[PDB]
């Protein structure tokens, strides 16, 4: 069969097969058909009579110039239609006749010059329309949109809109039941007429790479006046040379909008102000700063009423002091600069993600660090040296804890989680941890996920350090340089479904070491130099054999490389 078969009687990827005609040899039950990159040229009446069940139809880049009325006539169960990259020069009035289910239409780069003559007014079930990268130069919304009641996403990015006039959204105004996300990214925009957005509300507005000047952006923002939006996103990724100044007053126009959530993604711009720059955002529930440089200023510590604060991929010069009474979720991630955590006062913080910053933590972890007792989630992975001093005092409600790839100090010779009786997920992988003290994990009676890959053990021996972890479901001991296991090590792990022991130096295991893993569903034992010289291997070869469905990858013996599951000992 020329057509690649992905899922029988369901999916087919007839990609680039020089099809001049729709393949008739295919089944009738096919729900997903990809005909992308085939010279179809013209889609005639009932082009798809042979596909009753079709739900997804990809006609990407099939040099289609004409689509006749009823080309998709019988496609009553089609939901997504991809036309992307077809040089359409003739669309009949009824080219989309029969598409009584269509929820998504992608018509990127279809030489579309305007929405006015686009014959889609009758597709009531349409939820998504993507017309990015066409020649559309008008923001005027066609009168048929009034029939497009379920439309939730309009993609107008990469077109030719330079001006938005007061008269452009009259039809949208008469639709006070619509929930529309609009993206106008990459339109050459210079003017938005004041008042055009009064009494308008959108779920989301994206404006990225739209303005040639931080004086033209301002003019366009003043024409946004009256707009009530759930999520405003302002992006600019085109800065080349030095870091560019983001004028402190460039945002004072945002006071005359209603925004619930705000993101500013201004690549290599730098802020020399905070308080007045972000004044018009004081009451936003979700604030977001991405890719910006914040050196001169270092204190968001005001009374901003933000509940969610996201600071990602920025340059800081120093870890900023934050003091916010209403912040519940903080995301401080993938930033560079000032490699040192500094105490914050964030009462009512429930979620704290501080991963991937290279930060050092000289004392950790307690309430006096964070200003909260409500912490449920704490992620300190991919940072520098974390020195433990406090056993999570004021933070006993923790349910998720992640330290992976951070250098942890004063943890292994202690019982630092003794108070964490609600902890469900703990990851200490690659934390320079060297196990000795059998008490390392005491107190973790409700723990289910324990990741400790890439560490090591005193004498490469795994002692009975999982005794009180009766709720354990997932355990990763991969890459731990293990040479010997304790025979009673997994005795309590009655609920363990996943055991990963791959990439160790295990030659053998104690007989009956899995006897009590009655819940075990998946096991990794590969990349270990197993020794298949009977009776030594008998227990393991026997166990892997009858439990073969459970084994992930392939355990093999040193030398022969024969699968350990394949060995039969006398
Ligand atoms: C941050 O919010 C406060 C209070 O929140 C009120 O905002 C009102 C405009 C309205 O949505 C109301 O329902 C909501 O409770 C704002 O205080 C308002 O300030 C204006 C002048 O700026 C006064 O005229 C209002 O009386 C006052 N609100 C009320 C009704 O007490 C505040 O302006 C706002 N600040 C920023 C930076 O946006
Ligand atoms: C071990 O896991 C069990 C089972 O999932 C947990 O039992 C739950 O306890 C909480 C706290 O009271 C209840 O809200 C749940 O309804 C219980 N689960 C059910 C449906 O049985 C237990 O908390 C965990 N830790 C232990 C036993 O200390």
UniProtKB/Swiss-Prot annotation:
Record's comment on post-translational modification: Likewise, mutants lacking two or more of the other N-glycosylation sites were deficient in interaction with LPS. Phosphorylated on tyrosine residues by LYN after binding lipopolysaccharide.
LRR repeats by residue range: 29-50, 53-74, 77-98, 101-122, 125-146, 150-173, 179-199, 201-221, 305-325, 326-347, 348-368, 374-396, 397-418, 422-430, 446-469, 471-492
GO molecular function terms listed in the Swiss-Prot or TrEMBL record: amyloid-beta binding; identical protein binding; lipopolysaccharide binding; lipopolysaccharide immune receptor activity; NAD+ nucleosidase activity, cyclic ADP-ribose generating; protein heterodimerization activity; signaling receptor activity; signaling receptor binding
One GO CC annotation: early endosome
Cystine bridges: 3-14, 255-280, 364-365
Inducing or repressing factors: By LPS in plasmacytoid dendritic cells.
Comment block on domains: The TIR domain mediates interaction with NOX4.
Note: His-430 and His-432 are found in TLR4 of human and several other primate species and may be responsible for inflammatory responses triggered by nickel (Ni(2+)). Ni(2+) may cross-link the two receptor monomers through specific histidines, triggering the formation of a dimer that structurally resembles that induced by LPS. This process may be the basis for the development of contact allergy to Ni(2+). A mouse model of contact allergy to Ni(2+) in which TLR4-deficient mice expresses human TLR4 has been proposed.
Family, similarity comment: Belongs to the Toll-like receptor family.
Role played: Transmembrane receptor that functions as a pattern recognition receptor recognizing pathogen- and damage-associated molecular patterns (PAMPs and DAMPs) to induce innate immune responses via downstream signaling pathways. At the plasma membrane, cooperates with LY96 to mediate the innate immune response to bacterial lipopolysaccharide (LPS). Also involved in LPS-independent inflammatory responses triggered by free fatty acids, such as palmitate, and Ni(2+). Mechanistically, acts via MYD88, TIRAP and TRAF6, leading to NF-kappa-B activation, cytokine secretion and the inflammatory response.
Protein name (Swiss-Prot/TrEMBL): Toll-like receptor 4
Native organism: Homo sapiens (Human)
Gene label: TLR4
Range within the parent protein: 27 to 527 of 839
